[PDB]
Amino acid sequence: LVEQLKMEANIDRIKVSKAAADLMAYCEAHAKEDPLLTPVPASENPFRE
Amino acid sequence: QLKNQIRDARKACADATLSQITNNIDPVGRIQMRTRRTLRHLAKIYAMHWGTDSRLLVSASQDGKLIIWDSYTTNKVHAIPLRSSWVMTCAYAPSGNYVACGGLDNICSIYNLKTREGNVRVSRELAGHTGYLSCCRFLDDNQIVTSSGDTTCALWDIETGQQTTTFTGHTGDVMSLSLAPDTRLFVSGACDASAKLWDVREGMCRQTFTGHESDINAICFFPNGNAFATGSDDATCRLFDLRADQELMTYSHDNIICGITSVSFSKSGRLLLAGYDDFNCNVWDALKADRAGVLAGHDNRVSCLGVTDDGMAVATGSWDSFLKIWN
Amino acid sequence: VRASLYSLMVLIILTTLVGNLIVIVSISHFKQLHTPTNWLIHSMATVDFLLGCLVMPYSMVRSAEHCWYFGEVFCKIHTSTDIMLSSASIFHLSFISIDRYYAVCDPLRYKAKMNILVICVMIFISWSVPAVFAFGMIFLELNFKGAEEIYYKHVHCRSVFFSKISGVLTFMTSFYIPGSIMLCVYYRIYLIAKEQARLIRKAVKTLGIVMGVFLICWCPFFICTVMDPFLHYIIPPTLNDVLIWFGYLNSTFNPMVYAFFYPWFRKALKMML
Amino acid sequence: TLSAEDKAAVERSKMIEKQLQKDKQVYRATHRLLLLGADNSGKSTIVKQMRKTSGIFETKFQVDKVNFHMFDVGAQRDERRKWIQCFNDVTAIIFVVDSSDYNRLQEALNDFKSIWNNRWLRTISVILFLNKQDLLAEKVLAGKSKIEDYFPEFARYTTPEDATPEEDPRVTRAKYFIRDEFLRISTASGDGRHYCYPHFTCSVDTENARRIFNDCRDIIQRMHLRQYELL
Amino acid sequence: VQLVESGGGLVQPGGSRKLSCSASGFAFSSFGMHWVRQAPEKGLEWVAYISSGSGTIYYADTVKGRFTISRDDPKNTLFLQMTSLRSEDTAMYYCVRSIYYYGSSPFDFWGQGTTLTVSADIVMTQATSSVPVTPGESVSISCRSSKSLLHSNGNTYLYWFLQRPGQSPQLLIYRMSNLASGVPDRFSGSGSGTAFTLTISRLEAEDVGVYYCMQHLEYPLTFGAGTKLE
Ligand SMILES: [NH3+]CCc1ccccc1
């Protein structure tokens, strides 16, 4: 358990703003191309009924 | 004082919250989704899992029944009766060849869909766990990872039928696990209000996340591969990061009392949609915790969710045995 | 005098169409109100709605005129319509009573014994038999057979008229049978509920309400219906009209009693609203 | 369904959907029961009387063309909090106690209280058993047992006049002390939604199955009498 | 898995004959069945059809009342009854399984067969009849359709069989693009909607045979002519 705690504490960390920047960059990169966020035109989707 | 040192390091590494960073982005105003089918099992439904072709899906019910649907034309393809009448989780292979099931028992069953005969038969009966199985997922056509009720996870080998690695360290029983996109590491949350990260290569725990009020009900992994989200019975949804080692912004509302049952992301990572006991499946903005969309239509507890691989549809199943494909 | 009667009428008609329609709408768009013992109320509500809309306005057309504007063969069908729907409603009442008997007689073998097949058969019978025998009685002219002079004189006097032979049978096959089953069933259920309650008094209230409503609504009508043939037709028609409207009033009182007095449907309706 | 293959696909789907009707017909006319006991309680003897790291075991018995499934949870973890949610549709919970140890009773009382007060398990009737009577009588009439030391209030007891025994006033007094101790927890709360049905069973009584049958019937009856406000 | 067929022989004209297809090695009650006829000097021809639960039965336009089809699940036997047979019905008969669901592989396993000696439908044609080949060259076979086989959903219902000289026909490509199970990963197929082609990259001594073209877009199942390779 002591060795496990030492291994846990041995890791390094990064700033919490770079992670937010990466997440928002990925979100804005892939936001417009997928149906859930941007409503697909009714011709493309297979669920029309 | 290792815990105190870790807490001090985490506090030092913290500079700002997600609200301050994300306040400079225009929010998503409103998202409205409506049904496009009702896939209609005798008892309640306890799990479901989308196929890799984004067309098929598999559902498991307390009757002791697995049904493989056809989400486009509503038809049924396969109906498998289980040997045990109590099943809690089912999994669909990434290659569309096998399925796996496991409930309150000490067994994981493997059914081989593609045979020379026009019937499905069990090909592997994985035994060796002590408590009830609460999650099972595939890595490929040869390796399967299970999380059980005896506070353990196990990585198996279907070909030989014997365990290959055992993951231990959780005090309470683990509920659900999610796999990383590269199938190298994974995460697993337990009832001890803690989620631990496991590495397959050496079979040892590498990271821990704690500080959540109650036991963990469901967990999901961010599409990027370096973040994840959890939902529990304390009416709170949490987000965590791997490298930052921080508990990031929480999606909660003051008018919610019951507990989350399942949490799933979106393909783009912009929306977090999670079920509840109050017959609903709420939708939150992943960066502002703004309630944008309520998906009503169920008359009982919501037990499963899931967004298809290409993101066209999301299917929800509840305790009245009605699967609904939202859109 | 005419205005008050007309107002009370339109009130009653607006009542029967509204309440029974709602007992059709509420049980139509819901999925937890689709039990095999909730389609009988559906059929009863449809019967009451049809009865109201097709028959009551013409009853007011007849009300004070003392004579029918419409045709001599355009009245014949109205009578057969009226000798069908009341019988259908009463039969549905009896079948509901039988279902409620099987609810607390052998509670273990309930689900297996009264699946949807039996309910559909009961609806089909309760809807086919009255239609057949009402049309046969009202179009074959078999109710005044051998009594042409009396029928002609009574019609000239100024119509639903029965002879000695056939009046017995209508009363006998459309009220006594129903009375003999619902009453005995609810007496047995009273005994069972009283003994269970004593082991551990709401049993009296519901049964008293149901049976009192049914009896006060129907029994005088058929009592006079069989009294008149055996006497010299001395009963004034001003009592016959009131008896007809008691019979009609039963139909508008039915859906309130059955569909609403029970909490589960009340909560379903409240959630729908 | 315009194409040729899609018609065979839809007919296969329909034929799949017409085997579920038979399963539903079988599943509606079957009563489910949940069995709980302890380590020393003779649940194994009972389940053998009606008729390998596994977790659940199956038992079936039929009386008068009535079918009962009896789910007995086997070798699991000591905590029953999380897998109890699956058993909120059962007809009744059979609970088993061995009244022959004089010390392994307080834990039994707390287990019974936990079962009674579980909010998932509310509105589920509890059938209750007592096992190993004969051992109880043997340990009662052989002396050297400090029953009053274990239960200080045992000494000042008077058999309810309702007793119907069928030999030793002290033995019956202790028996009804145990019975009333179990009944106190059930009578403390409940609000008239679920009931308890205590009994007195020997090691192997052939009548046992019939017993359950009767109890089950009563429960269902009361449920109906409340669904109609006719109780 | 194997299917054994019995019956046939020498029958006088106007008689009645019964042919039996016995199945042993799979779930016979979950499979639709067909019957395919091949003349001694001509190609294949579809004869009848029967569904899994006998809920739907089709028939050929050439013969409609002369042939009766039946199945027996508990004994797992398929019966074909012929009465008032003419001189044309003197060909080889083949017993064919087929299972239809999303992603299935119809028309895969063929029986051995038993000998017998006494309009608006879409027609399909083959350009060639016989070409010379060498062990190692590339081979292309062309098939032409009288109508566009592509459907609204997207499926292109066409099949290639490629029997061998002395054995029962097999399955190579189903739905114009999907490879079969046991065939080696060197065959290929392509098309545009009306004309289709099949390509073989390598060539071995086992590839000698006759290549066949089939359509499955409407009720009739019409074949091609054949393309022998030497
Ligand atoms: N409102 C009159 C209804 C009726 C009259 C006679 C027989 C049956 C029914």
In this structure, what DSSP letter does residue E164 have? -
Which of B170, B220, B215, B212 has its CA nearest to residue B191?
B215
Query: Is B302 an 8 Å CB contact of chain A?
Result: no
> What secondary structure does DSSP assign to B193-221, as a single string?
TEEEEEETTTTEEEEEEE--SS-EEEEEE
What's the CA gap between C107 and C114, in Å, rounded?
12
Q: What are the Cα distances from residue B192, in Å, to B174, B197, B322?
A: 8, 15, 32
Q: What is the largest CA-CA distance in chain E?
A: 51
**Is C203's C-beta closer than 6 angstroms to any atom of ligand 1?**
no
Q: Where are the alpha helices (DSSP H) in chain B?
A: 2-13, 18-22
Of the candidate CATH numbers 3.90.45.10, 1.10.20.10, 4.10.260.10, 3.90.650.10, the domain formed by A1-47 belongs to: 4.10.260.10
In sequence order, the 6+-apart residues with CB closer than 8 A to the CB of A12 are none
Q: Which two tokens stand for residue E127?
A: 């350009």
In sequence order, the 6+-apart residues with CB closer than 8 A to the CB of D29 are C109, C111, C112, D67
In this structure, what DSSP letter does residue D154 have? G
In sequence order, the 6+-apart residues with CB closer than 8 A to the CB of C61 are C68, C69, C70
Q: What are the Cα distances from residue C37, in Å, to B42, B161, C21, C40, C255?
A: 19, 51, 18, 6, 15
**Is C170's C-beta closer than 6 angstroms to any atom of ligand 1?**
yes
In sequence order, the 6+-apart residues with CB closer than 8 A to the CB of D205 are D49
Cβ atoms B89, B60 nearer than 8 A: yes
Q: Which two tokens stand for residue D109?
A: 């009382």
Residue nearest to atom 2 of ligand 1 (CA): C244
In this structure, what DSSP letter does residue B173 have? P
Identity of the amino acid at D213: F
- Output the CA torsion C173→C176→C177→C182 (10° steps): 140
Cβ atoms A36, B266 nearer than 8 A: yes
**Residues pairing with D56 in the sheet:** D73
Which of B189, B154, B183 has its CA nearest to residue B168?
B154
* H or E segment and range at residue E179: strand E178-179
What's the CA gap between E173 and E215, in Å, rounded?
12
Determine the residue of chain B that is closest to D21 in CA distance: B42
Domain layout of chain E by residue ranges: 1-118, 121-225
Residues of D in contact with C264 (CB under 8 A): 227
> What secondary structure does DSSP assign to B241-282, as a single string?
ETTT--B---B--TT--S----EE--SSS-EEEEE-SSS-EE
- Output the CA torsion E14→E18→E19→E21 (10° steps): 160
What's the CA gap between D180 and B65, in Å, rounded?
44
For a substitution probing ligand 1, which of C83, C85, C87 has the most ligand atoms within 8 Å of its CB? C83
Homologous superfamily of D31-224: P-loop containing nucleotide triphosphate hydrolases (3.40.50.300)
Give the angle subtended at the CA of D191 by the CAs of D186 and D196, to the nearest 5°: 30
Q: Which two tokens stand for residue D151?
A: 């239960």
Q: Do B312 and A24 touch (CB under 8 A)?
A: no
**Is C81's C-beta closer than 6 angstroms to any atom of ligand 1?**
no
Which of B126, B137, B123 has its CA nearest to residue B162?
B126
**CA D180 to the chain's CA centroid:** 18
Cβ atoms E68, E85 nearer than 8 A: no
Identity of the amino acid at D134: D
Q: Do B132 and D13 touch (CB under 8 A)?
A: no
Phi, psi for residue D17 in degrees, rounded to 5:
-85, 0
Burial class (CB in 10 A: 0-12, 13-18, 19+), E35: buried
**Is C257's C-beta closer than 6 angstroms to any atom of ligand 1?**
no
Shortest distance between the Cα of B117 and any Cα of chain E, in A, equals 5
Q: What are the Cα distances from residue B25, in Å, to B21, B238, B240?
A: 9, 21, 21
Cβ of C218: how many Cβ atoms within 10 Å? 21
D109 alpha carbon to ligand 1 midpoint, in Å? Answer: 66
What Rg value do the Cα atoms of chain C yield, rounded?
20
* Adjacency order of strands within the sheet including E139-145: E124-126, E139-145, E195-200, E187-191
- Match 């089939």 to its residue by tokens: E214
Query: Is C31 an 8 Å CB contact of chain D?
Result: no
**CA D230 to the chain's CA centroid:** 27
Q: Where are the alpha helices (DSSP H) in D51-122?
A: 106-117
Way the structure was solved: cryo-EM
Helix and strand tally (H, E) in chain A?
A: 2, 0
Q: Which two tokens stand for residue C252?
A: 């508008």
Domain layout of chain D by residue ranges: 31-224
**Is C250's C-beta closer than 6 angstroms to any atom of ligand 1?**
no
Cβ atoms B240, B227 nearer than 8 A: yes
Q: What are the Cα distances from residue E116, in Å, to C164, E45, E65?
A: 81, 15, 19
**C82 carries a ligand binding annotation:** yes
Which of B203, B149, B211, B145 has its CA nearest to residue B178?
B145
C176 alpha carbon to ligand 1 midpoint, in Å? Answer: 14
Q: What is the largest CA-CA distance in chain C?
A: 65
- Match 């009714």 to its residue by tokens: A42
**Could you give the count of Cα atoms lying within 13 Å of C233 in the half-sphere of its Cβ?**
11
- Closest partner residue to B267 (CB to CB) among A21, A36, A40 is A36
**Residues pairing with C88 in the sheet:** none
Q: What are the Cα distances from residue B209, in Å, to B188, B251, C53?
A: 10, 17, 69
Determine the residue of chain E that is closest to D5 in CA distance: E100
Query: Is B266 an 8 Å CB contact of chain A?
Result: yes
* Adjacency order of strands within the sheet including E16-24: E2-6, E16-24, E77-83, E67-72
> What secondary structure does DSSP assign to chain C, as a single string?
-HHHHHHHHHHHHHHHHHHHHHHHHTTTS-SSS--TTSHHHHHHHHHHHHHHHHHHHHHHHHHTTSS-SS-SSSSHHHHHHHHHHHHHHHHHHHHHHHHHHHHTTSGGGHHHHS-HHHHHHHHHHHHHHHHHHHHHHHHTT-SSTT-HHHHHHHHHH------HHHHHHHHIIIIIHHHHHHHHHHHHHHHHHHHHHHH--HHHHHHHHHHHHHHHHHHHHHHHHHHHHHTTS-S-HHHHHHHHHHHHHHHHHHHIIIIISSHHHHHHHHHH-
Sort residue E79 into left (φ over 0), alpha (ψ -120 to 50) or beta: beta
Shortest distance between the Cα of B144 and any Cα of chain E, in A, equals 25
* H or E segment and range at residue B150: none
Interhelix angle C164-171/C202-230, nearest 10 degrees: 170
Cβ atoms B250, B206 nearer than 8 A: no
Q: Do E1 and B118 touch (CB under 8 A)?
A: no
Chains E and C touch (3+ CB pairs under 8 A): no
Q: Which two tokens stand for residue E77?
A: 């036997």
Cβ atoms E64, E9 nearer than 8 A: no
Identity of the amino acid at C261: F
SS3 B168: coil
Residue nearest to atom 7 of ligand 1 (CA): C83
Q: Do E102 and B119 touch (CB under 8 A)?
A: no
**Is C226's C-beta closer than 6 angstroms to any atom of ligand 1?**
no
Residues of E in contact with B55 (CB under 8 A): 102
Which atom of ligand 1 is nearest to C174's Cα? 8
Q: Which fold has domain B1-326?
A: Methylamine Dehydrogenase; Chain H (2.130.10)
What's the CA gap between B167 and B177, in Å, rounded?
12
Q: Do E25 and B70 touch (CB under 8 A)?
A: no
**Is C83's C-beta closer than 6 angstroms to any atom of ligand 1?**
yes
Cβ atoms B81, B58 nearer than 8 A: no
Determine the residue of chain D that is closest to B172 in CA distance: D79
Domain layout of chain B by residue ranges: 1-326
Q: Which two tokens stand for residue C25?
A: 């709408």
Q: What are the Cα distances from residue E16, in Å, to D63, E9, E11, E12, E39?
A: 56, 12, 8, 9, 20
Q: Do D29 and C111 touch (CB under 8 A)?
A: yes
Domains, in order of start, for chain C: 2-272 (1.20.1070.10)
Which of B165, B219, B213, B224 has its CA nearest to residue B196?
B219
C79 alpha carbon to ligand 1 midpoint, in Å? Answer: 9
What's the CA gap between E228 and E230, in Å, rounded?
7
